[PDB]
Amino acid sequence: PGVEIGNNDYYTWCKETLSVIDKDLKISGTHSYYENQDRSQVSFIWGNIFLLYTYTEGISLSKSEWSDALMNCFLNFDNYWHPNYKGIAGYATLPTSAEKVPDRFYDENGWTAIGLCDAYLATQNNSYLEKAKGALAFSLSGEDNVLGGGIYFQETFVSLPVQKNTICSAVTMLSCMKLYEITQDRQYLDAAIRINDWTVENLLDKSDNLLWDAKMVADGSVNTQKWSYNAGFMIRSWLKMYQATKDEKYLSQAKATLASSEAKWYNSINGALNDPGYFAFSIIDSWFDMYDTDKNTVWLTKAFHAINFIHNKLRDGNGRYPEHWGTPTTSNLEKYDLRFSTVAAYMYMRAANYKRILN
Hints:
Elements: H1 2-5, H2 10-25, H3 45-61, H4 63-77, E1 81-85, E2 88-91, H5 106-123, H6 126-140, E3 163-165, H7 166-183, H8 186-203, E4 204-205, E5 210-211, E6 214-216, E7 222-223, H9 228-245, H10 248-265, H11 277-294, H12 298-314, H13 338-358
Protein name: Alpha-1,6-mannanase
GO biological process, one term: carbohydrate metabolic process
Keywords: Signal
């Protein structure tokens, strides 16, 4: 790992990235962010989730440097919280309030629940755990026996056909496992197992152990598009299920899917990940989880090599990041959205933490 981690100051790289994000996208006088370079709409929740993940990981490096930033982000997330729409609370894709009709997604709630669980673990702040539980309850309310199980993409389908989605399974499973570890409430473990059983039966390709995208409710047809994050969030879930149950099937499945994910998406020679960054980061988090599992530094070698590539080859001359992680940047970006640089910041903070753990 030291060959790749060398003199690379991941922590500084993270602060650098955050500084550029704030300059470009923080809405003057607030702790909220614009969606993109046009600075014309408040950001969708997703890009803010990477900031939540970043500040949370920051606590492991310095509680005093990052606690306020994390709290300010949590308070910004309150702008997206709906306390009761049609009988249930949950986060919306855009800012909302009790008197407005929100557009809510079961996946967004799971992504957020993961970050809030980690924020609670880092700080022991009860308000973070309250919202983690509430976000996860929202995601779990999207599960029913249509298609025999699984979770809808979204609460209010308009243009998209009604469908149940691997990402919704996967982030809900991981959230369940994180809350199981915190609360020791077996209902969370049982939910993860139930959702996993459905997901493996319906959306896992047995030929390569990768995950299809979604199953359509109308006719049960499968969108067979393979995305990195559908593998990655399943891997992270399975590793927690392995720790909880001691059933080796979960570890074997995680290892099989991770190997196939590396073969499909990872160029180990240069470090490039051939998918959108806001998806492919999940393979890097899988590597970190593998190191936590088996303490084999090969997994950190991969992670640091991929993160070095992001800094050395994707970062443009203005300190901005592209959507996709597959190819070096050769000219400066004119367009960008919040998620592109926030996922990079998150990776840098993760790398900083593991460098610290090693040294």
